[PDB]
């Protein structure tokens, strides 16, 4: 591929420059090339990979929603459907790319808990994005299975305040509410996650307290929205 002749460290460096320039397609392509060197990603590198693709797919999802709304209104020529399909196909291509990187390179049995949960959460997220545009049962179950494996690891190997564990619970609860037609489960998960983190905040330094409480606040925002 186009990144095969570039040094791993240069790909990482350019991913950081692309982020500074808000060139997220480039950032994602550099991080993909770095993944393809076959070495594990550090914590910082995992965050670069995630930010890059989040921004790419985020723009596609937002455009898909705009076009789908226009299409739904026009349904009370073929152009609106054609263009919504074009954006949808590009979005699915990016999700397939990410899921491919996760399955071929990043998801392993032998990881530390922090990386294993991070990547399984990511798998759940990208199946969830595919589910948003599908018309779906099998994609929904793939997202559920990935989130559930991540949840099982996170409850056994991480404290209830761990920010990766908290963000996984936040997104799995959104999955329950928005995708899986399970709002009661979504609310229960957000509640118990918030309460179990609250009870352990006293163990945290000032820095860890900030990281954990910021995600707890997001859980509470969703809880107060939903109830």
């Amino acid at each position: 591929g186009a990144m095969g002749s570039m040094e791993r460290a240069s790909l990482i460096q350019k991913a950081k420059l692309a982020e500074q320039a808000e060139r997220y397609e480039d950032m994602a392509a550099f991080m993909k090339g770095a993944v393809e060197k076959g070495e594990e990603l550090s914590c910082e590198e995992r965050n670069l990979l995630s930010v890059a693709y989040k921004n790419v797919v985020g723009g596609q999802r937002a455009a898909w929603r705009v076009l789908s709304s226009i299409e739904q209104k026009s349904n009370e020529g073929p152009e609106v459907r054609e263009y919504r399909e074009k954006v949808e196909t590009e979005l699915q291509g990016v999700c397939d790319t990410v899921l491919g990187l996760l399955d071929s390179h990043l998801i392993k049995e032998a990881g530390d808990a922090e990386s294993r949960v991070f990547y399984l959460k990511m798998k759940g997220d990208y199946y969830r994005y595919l589910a948003e545009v599908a018309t779906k049962k099998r994609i929904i179950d793939s997202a559920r299975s990935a989130y559930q494996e991540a949840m099982d690891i996170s409850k056994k190997e991480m404290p209830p305040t761990n920010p990766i564990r908290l963000g996984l619970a936040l997104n799995f609860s959104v999955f329950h509410y928005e995708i899986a037609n399970s709002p009661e489960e979504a609310i229960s998960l957000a509640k118990t996650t918030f309460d179990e983190a609250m009870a352990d905040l006293h163990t945290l330094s000032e820095d860890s307290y900030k990281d954990s409480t910021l995600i707890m606040q997001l859980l509470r925002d969703n809880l107060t929205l939903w109830t």
Binding site: N47, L170, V174, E178, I215, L218
Partner: peptide, 7 residues
Amino acid sequence: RTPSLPG
């Protein structure tokens, strides 16, 4: 939709 993790 409900907001997911912003990062």
